[PDB]
Write a protein that binds this ligand. Structure first.
Ligand SMILES: O=C(O)[C@@H](CO)OP(=O)(O)O
Ligand SMILES: O=C(O)[C@@H](CO)OP(=O)(O)O
Ligand SMILES: O=C(O)[C@@H](CO)OP(=O)(O)O
Ligand SMILES: O=C(O)[C@@H](CO)OP(=O)(O)O
Ligand SMILES: [Mg+2]
Ligand SMILES: [Mg+2]
Ligand SMILES: [Mg+2]
Ligand SMILES: [Mg+2]
Lengths: 423, 423, 423, 423
C-alpha cells in the first residue's frame, strides 16, 4: 500500500543561488519521490510565510530552520497516513502548523511535503504525475507564455514592466509551439545585437536590455517574431506581467514611466496597447490591494483581453472569491508556493474554473530543476503556462517535460492553441 | 502493466426489464472490471444511436447485435492498448465506428467498453474509480436531486411535468442529506395515503399519483418536507425536469396543462413558481431545438434560478458550445450514454465548467445495478446528482456508493450543501 | 538480468534554447534510465561530430537526424547486450558508426546511449551512479570551480578571457564549499551594482559586465571574496579558462587585449598574474594546435600553477598521450561529449591519472537538467569540477546532486579541499 | 537491501599449513560471501598487527583469539550497516579497534570482515567483484609476475635474493601470457634436472635450488625462456624482489653475497644487471627504513627500470606519501593485509596512481584458496600482479580466476602487455 513510511528534507540552491527546501518521501511499498520548492524574488504580502533561518549564512536566506520542521514535526505527523489521500495529508500539515499564513512550519516546508507526497502517490499508482492529478482526461498541452525580455525585479535594469512574453497561439502542436518561441528568442538576441543593446539574461532567462519604454520593448519583440518568419498575432501573440504592486505606493498611486499615475490613468494606457499590439493577456496591471482600480480596468477592457490576477489573489480561494464577487479579472495565475499546498491550489483552480475564470500555472524568479508544474498545467487543463524563456534549464526543463507528456499522450494530446483565448 | 487482454460482453436486463449491454475487460496483469449501460425511456433525437436487435425477442429491444459488435469488432481493436490511455481507447472506438452518431457499433456497445476500460484502469492503479477519474482532489459529495413524484414518460399517469424532486441543500453531510430525502419520501407516502392518492411507483421510483396540476404536486411535496420536520427551502429545496420536448409539437408549440402555449407563455408560468415555491433548478423547460425560447427564459429568470439543459445539449460539446455562445441555460445535465464515451462526457463537463456552467450527473429511466455515476459525480466535483428516488436499488445503489465514498474520504469529504446554487 | 530491451530517443532544448539529444533505455528487468547530451557554444576542431539536422528548424541546429539514428540503427544494435558491459556496448556503438570522429551516427547520439546505458546499469545494480562507476571507494567531493564572471564566447561582451572562477579550497566540506561560492557570487552582484556595471548573466550564469581588462575582473572577484568575509587564497582561490583557441589566428598568433602576442609574450603575462593573484589553475592559455607554446608555458610556470588542457586534448587519449610525451600541461579537462563515450572518457581519465596529471570534470555552455557529471566527478575522484556559477539550474542542479552524494556518503565523504592542488 | 545481518568467522590453514582468519557475511537479502586472510612468512615492521593466539597450538600461530574478536566485537558493531558503504564499514572497524597498527582486534580479523563485506556487496549488486570494486571500466588484465626460482625466506636454501620472476610482457592476451609463464616454468624444471639441481618447490611454488649467485639464477631462467621457444626481453622479461630488509642490519648495512655492502655499493650491482639482463622491475632492493639509499637508487636507475616499494611502504598512505615527497621508487606493491582494510588499500592505490606511481597487486608466502586479489588487480587496472609461480593452487587459483575475468570481459578485455612498463 502507498503508506508514508519516511519523510526526509534537505537544503538546496534555487536558480538565483538562494537556498530552498527539497523534500523526499518513502512509502511502505518502497516508493521514492522528491519535490523541491521554488521562491519568488519579490513575494506578495498575502503569500504563505517562507521560513528563513536568518543570520550570517546565505545572507540570512538559509532554510535549515524549515528542514528541521520537516524532520522533527511533519515526518512524525504524516507517517502512517495514505499518500493518495492528498486532502487528508494536506489538512494534517495545515492543522499541525495551525496558523492562517503557514508561519509556524513554513509554506516552503509544508508544500515540500505536499508535492513529494503527491509524486509518491502517482509513482505507487504507476501513473505519470499529470495523469494521477488530472485523471485519464488530462491531455491539453498549454500555450507557453515565454518571458523573453525581463524588467522590474528580475533585472538590475531601469525597465518598469516586469515581464514581456510571446504566445505561439497559432502553433499546431506543443513541439512546434516550443520551436517558435525558441526561434523568436534567438531572433530577438540578434535584433538586440544589431541595436547594440544588452543580451545578458535576467532571472527568468529573458534578455535584460535598458530599453527606453514599454512601447520600445514590444516593438523589438514584434521585430523578432517577424525576423523568425512568423506573423505577430495569428502565429505569435504578446503578453505582460505589469507587476504594478512593485511600482505602487500604498494609498498614493503607481510611479510608472516618468508620471505617477491613477488606476484610471494606467487603465487608459493599457487600452492604448490593446489597439497598437496583439496582446492576449495582461497580469497584475494594478496593485495587490487596489480593489477599486481592478474592477474599472476589468469592466473597461475585460471584453477585449485576458486580465490575470497574480499578487491580488496570491493563489488564495479567499482572495479569489472576493475578486469573482467584485468581478475583478477573468483569470487566476496559479502558484503552489503562494497558497502552500497542492489541494489548496486545486481548490483555487476549481473556484476560478467554476466561476468561468481561466488559469495560468506559473513558476517563480527562483526555480529548481523540478518539473512538477509542467504536469500540473496539463492535469488542470489550464492550456496556459508561464515557466519563463527558452533559456536557463530551470525554465527549459519544464518545456522538456511538456514535450515528454505530449509524446506519452500521442494522438490523445491536443495543443490549447488559440482556443486558450476567445478574444 | 494495464494492457487490455480480453473484452467480453453479454445481454442483461435494466430496471424496466429491457435488455442492455454489459461489458467485461481483463488486463494482462489479471485486472477484471465490469460496466453496464443504461437506457432512457424517451431518448432525445440528438443522442448516440442505441443498437437494438429488432424482431420478436424483448419486443425488438434485444442487444445481441451490439454484443457481437463488442466480441467481433471492438475487442480485437482495443486489445493491446493501455487501459489508462482513456482518450486513445475512446478515440479508437469512435474511429472504428466511423459515424457522427455512433450508429455502426452503437453508443451502448462503445460506452460499455469505454466505462469497463476506465474501471479496469482504476483497479490496476489500485484507486477507487472517483479518485482515478477526478485525481486526488475528488472530494465534493453531490446534493442528491431525488425525484419522489414521477410524471411524463416514467408514469402511465396524466401528469405533464416528468420529474418532481427534493434537494436537501441544508444538510451538513451526504449521510444526513440522504436521510432527509429518505425521511421526506416516506412522509410523502403517508401524505398520499391520507389524500387517498396512489403510492404505486414510477420508473425512477417516485410516487405516480394522478395529481390535478403542477402546483398540486409541489404543494404535496412541501407538506411532506414539513411533515418530516425539515424546513422547505433552507433545509430542503425543490427541482423539476419539465422535459418540454416530450410535450412540444415541432413548429407548433407546447401542449401543457389544457392550453397549448408559447415559450414566452411557458416562461411566465415558470417565473410564477420561482415566486410561489423554493425552486433551485428547472430542467428542459423548453424543447430540444426551440433555441429561441431558451435564450428568453435564460435571459428572463437565469439570475433567479438554475436552468439545466438535458435534451437541448444531449451531453454534446457541439450542442453545448452553441448554447454557451447563444447564452442558453447555466447548467449541463451530464449523461454518459447520450454522448457515448467517458472522454467525450468529460470534454462536455470541461466545456461547461470552463464556460461558468454548473453540471448535474444523471441516470436514465432504465438503470442497472451499476454505481459508476456515483463515482463520476464526485470525480467531476459537480456537487449535484440526479439518480432518482430513495426507492428501487438501481437508484439507491448509487446513494449507497456515495455513502462509501464519503466514508473513504473521511474529514477530506465536503458536502456541496447550499454552495451548489449561489441563487 | 540488466539486458537492454528498448532504446528510445527524443529532441529537447539545452540551457541556451538549442535542441539536443535525450536517450531512454529499458532493461528486460524493467529498469528505466534517461540521459541528455550537452553542447559547447564554440566546439574545438578535434571534438566528436555533433550530428545537426540543418535547414530551417532551430536555425539548422535540430537533432531529429541524430534521434532517428538512435531509433533506427543503435537501438537494434545494442538491444540484447548487457547494460553493465559498458566497454562492449561502447565498442559496438563505435564500430556501428565506424568513423574516427563519430561523424556517421554522431557523438551526440552515440553518447546519449553510452550514458543512458550506464545509468540503467547502476539502477539495476541498485547503486547510485557515482558508486557503480567509481566502485565502493568513490567518496571525494570535488572543489567547485565556479565561473562567476563570464567573457569570451559565453557573453556578447568585449571581455577576452572566457571564464573567471572562484575555488573555495579552504572549505571544510562541500556543503560549506558551495555556500562560500554562492555567498561570494551574491557579493560580486552587489560590487557590480556599486560600480554601475551589468549583472545580466552569461551562458554559464556568471555576470557579463564589459570590464576594461583581465586585471580589472580578478580585482572585482577579490573584492567580492573579501566582502563575503572570506580570505582570497586560503579560503577562496582563483582560476581561468583563457580559451586562447577562440582568440588565436592559425599560424599568426593570439589577438589578446590590444596587442597581438606570441605564446612567449602571453606566457610572461600569465606568470605576472601568478605573482599578483592567488591562481590555482589556468585552462587553454594557448591554442589547440600551438604544441610548441604549451611546452614552454608548462616548462616555465608548471611548478607554480595547475595548467588545464581543454581544446588541446578534447578528452582524447590520442591527443592526451602526445601531451604527456611532450610534457604539455599537468591536468586534463574531462568532457564526455568531446570524446563521445563514457569508456573513452574513463580511458582518458585513466591515462591522465596514471601519467600523474590531475583531471577536472566539465559541463558545456549548453547544459541540460542532467546531473550525470556530478556523479562522474566523485566516481573518478578528480576532486575538481567546473559546472558553472551558483546560478541557472543547469549548473545548480549538479551542485544540488553533489550535496546529495555528500549526504549519502556521510562520514565516508571527504572534501578534496586544498589537497586538490599541491601548489 | 544489502544490510549486514550476520558475521561469522573460523580458523583455517594457509598454504604453509599455518592457521589464519576466514570470515563469512550474510545480508538481510540472504547474500552469503566468504573471505580468507593471507599471511607473509617474514612481515615488515610497519605492517598491521596479526593477532596470534600464542601458546602450544600450531606453535603459537593459532588465530582463535582473532576469531572471537569477530564473533564477539566486530559482528555486533557492523550488523545493521549497509555492505556497499565500504568506507563507513571500514571506518567503523578502524574506530572499534582504535589503535594505529590495528593491534586490538588484529588486521587479520579487521580485513577478514573488510573483504567479506566487499564480496557480499558485489553479490547483492549481482556484479563480479572486479566490476563492483573497479566500476564498469575494469578491463585491464595484468601482466603475471611469476616467481619461478625461490630464495630468501620462502626457501631453506642459501640464495640471497627472495624472488626471481618472469614477465610475459610480449603476450597478445592473458590466456597466452599464462601459457608462456607455465611453459617457461616447465622448461626451467627440465634445465634444473639437466644441471642436477633441486626441483623441490619453495613457499610461492618456484624451484628452490642452491644456485651459486644472483647471475647464475637469472642465467638459468633465460635458458628456460629460450628452451620454451620465447625470446627473453620482447616476449618474456625478468623481475626481482631483492627483499633487502631480510638481509640488512639496522644501522650497519646489507650482508649480500659474501661482501657486507653499502646502499651505493648495492646500487652499482643493480645497475650492472639492467645492462646484463632484460629486467623491467626490482622490488625492495634496499631496507624498509634505509630512506637515504632508495632516493640515490631511484635517482640513479629510475629512468632505466621500475623500482617497487614493498616493506618501505607496507601499503601505507603515510609511508607512501613520504616516499613520493622524497622521490623514493616509481611503484607501490599493494598488499591488503599490510594496511588492514580494502578502503585503506584503495586510498594507497589512489595516492600512488595520482602521484604517477605504478602499482603491483601482491599475494603472501602464506596464501589461501581465496582469489580476491585476481579481481582486485583488474578493478584497480594495475596491469601487474605477483601471485607466484604457475604451481601450487593458492597461486594458480588466481590465474584461473584471471582467465575467467578475461572470458567474461570478451572483446572488452585488454592485456596490459608491454604497456605496463614504458622503459
Ligand atoms: O510575478 C510573477 O508572476 C512571478 C514570476 O513567476 O514573480 P516572482 O516569482 O518574483 O514572485
Ligand atoms: O429526462 C431525463 O433527465 C432522464 C431521466 O434521467 O429521462 P430518460 O432517462 O427517460 O431519458
Ligand atoms: O571552454 C570550456 O571549457 C567550455 C565550458 O565548459 O566551453 P564550451 O562549452 O563552449 O566548449
Ligand atoms: O616480499 C613479498 O612481496 C612477499 C611475497 O608476496 O613476501 P611475504 O609474503 O613473505 O611478506
Ligand atoms: Mg507578478
Ligand atoms: Mg429530460
Ligand atoms: Mg576552453
Ligand atoms: Mg619483499
Amino acid at each position: 500500500m502507498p503508506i508514508i513510511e519516511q519523510v526526509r528534507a534537505r537544503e538546496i540552491l534555487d536558480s538565483r543561488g538562494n537556498p530552498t527546501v527539497e523534500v523526499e518521501v518513502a512509502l511502505i511499498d518502497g516508493t521514492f519521490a522528491r519535490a523541491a520548492v521554488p521562491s519568488g524574488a519579490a513575494t506578495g504580502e498575502h503569500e504563505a510565510v517562507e521560513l528563513r533561518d536568518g543570520g550570517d549564512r546565505y545572507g540570512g536566506k538559509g532554510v535549515q530552520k524549515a528542514v528541521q520542521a520537516v524532520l522533527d514535526e511533519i515526518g512524525p505527523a504524516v507517517i502512517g497516513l495514505n499518500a493518495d489521500d492528498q486532502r487528508l495529508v494536506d489538512q494534517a500539515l495545515v492543522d499541525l502548523d495551525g496558523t492562517p499564513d503557514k508561519s509556524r512550519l513554513g509554506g516552503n516546508a509544508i508544500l515540500g511535503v505536499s508535492l513529494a507526497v503527491a509524486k509518491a502517490a502517482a509513482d505507487s499508482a504507476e501513473l505519470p504525475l499529470f495523469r494521477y492529478v488530472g485523471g485519464p482526461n488530462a491531455h491539453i498541452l498549454p500555450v507557453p507564455m515565454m518571458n523573453i525580455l525581463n524588467g522590474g525585479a528580475h533585472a538590475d535594469t531601469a525597465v518598469d514592466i516586469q515581464e514581456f512574453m510571446v504566445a505561439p497561439i497559432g502553433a499546431p502542436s506543443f513541439v512546434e509551439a516550443l520551436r517558435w518561441g525558441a526561434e523568436v528568442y534567438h531572433a530577438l538576441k540578434s535584433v538586440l545585437k544589431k541595436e547594440g543593446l544588452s543580451t545578458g539574461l535576467g532571472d527568468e532567462g529573458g534578455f535584460a536590455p535598458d530599453v527606453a519604454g514599454t512601447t520600445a520593448a514590444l516593438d523589438l519583440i514584434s521585430r523578432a517574431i517577424e525576423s523568425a518568419g512568423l506573423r505577430p498575432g495569428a502565429d505569435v501573440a504578446l503578453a505582460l506581467d505589469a507587476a504594478a504592486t512593485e511600482f505602487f505606493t500604498d494609498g498614493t498611486g503607481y510611479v510608472f514611466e516618468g508620471t505617477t499615475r491613477t488606476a484610471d490613468q494606467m487603465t487608459e494606457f493599457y487600452a492604448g496597447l490593446l489597439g497598437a499590439y496583439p496582446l492576449v493577456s495582461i497580469e497584475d496591471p494594478l496593485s495587490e490591494d487596489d480593489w477599486d482600480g481592478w474592477a474599472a480596468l476589468t469592466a473597461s477592457i475585460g471584453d477585449r483581453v485576458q486580465i490575470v490576477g497574480d499578487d491580488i489573489f496570491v493563489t488564495n480561494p479567499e482572495r479569489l472569491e472576493e475578486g469573482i464577487e467584485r468581478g475583478v479579472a477573468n483569470a487566476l495565475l496559479v502558484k503552489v508556493n503562494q497558497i502552500g499546498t497542492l489541494t489548496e491550489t486545486l481548490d483555487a483552480v476549481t473556484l476560478a474554473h467554476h466561476g468561468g475564470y481561466r488559469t495560468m500555472i506559473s513558476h517563480r524568479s527562483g526555480e529548481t530543476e523540478d518539473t512538477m508544474i509542467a504536469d500540473l498545467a496539463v492535469a488542470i487543463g489550464s492550456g496556459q503556462i508561464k515557466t519563463g524563456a527558452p533559456a536557463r534549464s530551470e525554465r527549459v526543463a519544464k518545456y522538456n517535460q511538456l514535450l515528454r507528456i505530449e509524446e506519452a499522450l500521442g494522438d490523445a494530446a491536443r495543443y490549447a492553441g488559440d482556443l486558450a483565448f476567445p478574444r
